[PDB]
Amino acid sequence: MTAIAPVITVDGPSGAGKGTLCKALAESLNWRLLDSGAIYRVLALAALHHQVDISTEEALVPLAAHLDVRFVSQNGQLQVILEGEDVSNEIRTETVGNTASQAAAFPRVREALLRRQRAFREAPGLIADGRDMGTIVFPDAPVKIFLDASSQERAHRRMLQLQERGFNVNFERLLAEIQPLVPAADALVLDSTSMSIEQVIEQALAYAQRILA
Template sequence: MTDHPEVPVIAVDGPGGSGKGTITQMLARRLGWHLLDSGALYRLTALAAEQQGVSLDDESALVRVALALDVAFEPTAPGEPVKVILAGVDVTREIRTERCGDNASRVAVMQPVRDALLQRQRDFRQAPGLVADGRDMGTVVFPDAPTKIFLTASAEERARRRYSQLKAAGLNVTMSDLLDEIRVRDERDMNRSAAPLKPASDAQVIDSTGLSIDEVLSEVLIAAGQT
């Protein structure tokens, strides 16, 4: 279990593009709590491995990379992604590419890598509270979290959102490619043996398709008893 069970946690799980990143940052700012972007840890492991010339098939080497990660999260302006610092360098943009996301999904299926990152994630649980963004926050990392949310949206809606984000960032992408990548990643994440993507048995499932960010935030705050 976690080191600080008395500290409240709002665990927000769900597939990529469901709005978890935006919602968890809004929650953390509104409540004045710490924020954990757990998916960034897997992306950082994949990025650091690539930088160090480590193969994504070399499980033992990936574990060493994960254990040695020098990571910090810094808050940013509302609507912006959390700033991610790797070994003193801002890699926020690098870890948000589709390539890095796909590599992170490959890394995340390896149980030894997940084990290496587990305690690091739990260490973010500090007073006054933690908002944890991920895919197994409520099922594995913080199973005793008093509030568990599973935020989802249709694959088409998530592809549309991702397309808008990437085009705004000046990247050349196509909707069809993004949709294909999202479906492949969903299939892999839901069927992996290590912590498959699924709602915790006591999670509240919120489908954000067709909802505004404010409407989703309202539902999450109600579920967390923080209205």
């Protein structure tokens, strides 16, 4: 239900400012935060730690279903906590994200993770950051937002990320490399291409706090 535990979903491609919009909404409203991309990686990090069979789906399903994960965000930085440990950096490595795509291939694991993500919906409220948040995870959410951006913009954001991790990147290689996913019919559509991220946040906040209150 809308009051009890409202959900604001934020859907879009990677590299559009979704992460940043969500951390900011979550700290402006003091709400819980679900980061969908990260949850698949935490599951795969949980799978590597407890070193379990990444075929057969039999062991990943209950892991997923009760995954001990929470997302805390203070002062703009995402803190990811698995079974107590801060695993923020651990879930960013390439091996982790390749085992996440391996788990993500079994439907029953996807359905398990879907139920785990719904269970994030609590008081006072949830900011849900993903791809299908407003269309599949929380189709009845009071506030849905779709945050798009051009391939160049997204390429640019990715370049800086890759460079921050240490790789040297070619912008034109990346752009071309980058060059389902749909707004929900009741999504507020924003484009961070020629808009500052502060403008996006302020429009998002104002939009949410006009529906919810």
